[PDB]
């Protein structure tokens, strides 16, 4: 379900097969490192900083079902455990660097909860700037002073 | 004494043609404002 | 002479040209062209605004379609496959 966006042979962010679309943050430079995915036609959406397309039939079995459901507590991401509370995702400062955009923040059942875009350093912890689902629609939470990763 | 600059007559008819122009301008002005209003709604939504 | 009947409609409007003239009509035509340009500019702006509206919902995922009809002629046709 997770695929990596490469730019000049360098991983910039990620792409994800959620629902029946193929997502990847709009701000991420590069092209999905997967033939089938790379040749697709994406529809950009600057409001959501999202850029979706449709999953080829032969990969649709590979999608992951997202969720608006996110109760205060700890979430999972590649570098460790993210913490959600006060309507804000945070992590120990240093555990997220430029080149981590696109990486999903899963919950314990695998549902993608948000997609990292960058983070604002506020000391001990960094408030993440993410793309998250609302009641049904996409949204973007960007803490004051975020540094786009 | 004639010999002056118009415009002058012919009323009605004249109004018929005049009324056709400028209305569409008002429409696109209103639509522009409405688009701005919706944009502000989106800005508020974010 | 060159009777300058009133109308109408229009018709007579052009008859006045002969009365007081060389000019008159050409300036009016230029004004009409300017009005057309304003009308065309408005339409172009409106189409760009229509894009601005369909924006956000330009990424992907269910959600119109839906408001895509009622939907300023695209909206749809657009939602679909």
From Swiss-Prot, chain C:
Interacts with spike glycoprotein E1. Processing of the precursor of protein E3/E2 into E2 and E3 results in a heterodimer of the spike glycoproteins E2 and E1. Spike at virion surface are constituted of a trimer of E2-E1 heterodimers. Interacts with 6K protein. Interacts with host MXRA8; this interaction mediates virus entry. The interaction involves 2 adjacent E2-E1 heterodimers. It is a single-pass type I membrane protein. Plays a role in viral attachment to target host cell, by binding to the cell receptor MXRA8. Synthesized as a p62 precursor which is processed by furin at the cell membrane just before virion budding, giving rise to E2-E1 heterodimer. The p62-E1 heterodimer is stable, whereas E2-E1 is unstable and dissociate at low pH. p62 is processed at the last step, presumably to avoid E1 fusion activation before its final export to cell surface. It comes from Chikungunya virus (strain 37997). It is found in: Virion membrane; Host cell membrane. Residues 47-81 are cytoplasmic. Palmitoylated via thioester bonds. These palmitoylations may induce disruption of the C-terminus transmembrane. This would result in the reorientation of E2 C-terminus from lumenal to cytoplasmic side. N-glycosylated. Disulfide bonds join 54-75. Residues 49-53 are annotated as: Interaction with the capsid protein. A lipid is attached at residues 54, 74-75 (S-palmitoyl cysteine). The chain crosses the membrane at residues 26-46. This is Spike glycoprotein E2. Glycans are attached at residue 3. Residues 54-74 are annotated as: Transient transmembrane before p62-6K protein processing.
């Amino acid at each position: 379900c997770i695929f990596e966006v490469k730019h000049e042979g360098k991983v910039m962010g990620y792409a994800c097969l959620v629902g029946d679309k193929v997502m990847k943050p709009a701000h991420v430079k590069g092209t999905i490192d997967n033939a089938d995915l790379a040749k697709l036609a994406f529809k950009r959406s600057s409001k959501y900083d999202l850029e979706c397309a449709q999953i080829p039939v032969h990969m649709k079995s590979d999608a992951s079902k997202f969720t608006h459901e996110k109760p205060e507590g700890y979430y999972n991401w590649h570098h460790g455990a993210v913490q959600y509370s006060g309507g804000r995702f945070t992590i120990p400062t240093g555990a997220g660097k430029p080149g981590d955009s696109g990486r999903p923040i899963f919950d314990n059942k695998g549902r993608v909860v948000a997609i990292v875009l960058g983070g604002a350093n506020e000391g001990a912890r960094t408030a993440l700037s993410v793309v998250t689902w609302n009641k049904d629609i996409v949204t973007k939470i960007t803490p004051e002073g975020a540094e786009e990763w | 004494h004639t010999t002056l600059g118009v415009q002058d007559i012919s009323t009605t008819a004249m109004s018929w043609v005049q009324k056709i122009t400028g209305g569409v301008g008002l429409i696109v002005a209103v639509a522009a404002l409405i688009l701005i209003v919706v944009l502000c709604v989106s800005f508020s939504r974010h | 002479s060159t009777n300058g009947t009133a109308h109408g409609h229009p018709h007579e409007i052009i008859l006045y040209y002969y009365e007081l003239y060389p000019t008159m009509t050409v300036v009016i035509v230029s004004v009409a062209s300017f009005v057309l340009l304003s009308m065309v500019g408005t339409a172009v702006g409106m189409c760009v605004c229509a894009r601005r509206r369909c924006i956000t919902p330009y990424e992907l995922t269910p959600g119109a379609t839906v408001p895509f009809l009622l939907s300023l002629l695209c909206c749809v046709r657009t939602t679909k496959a």
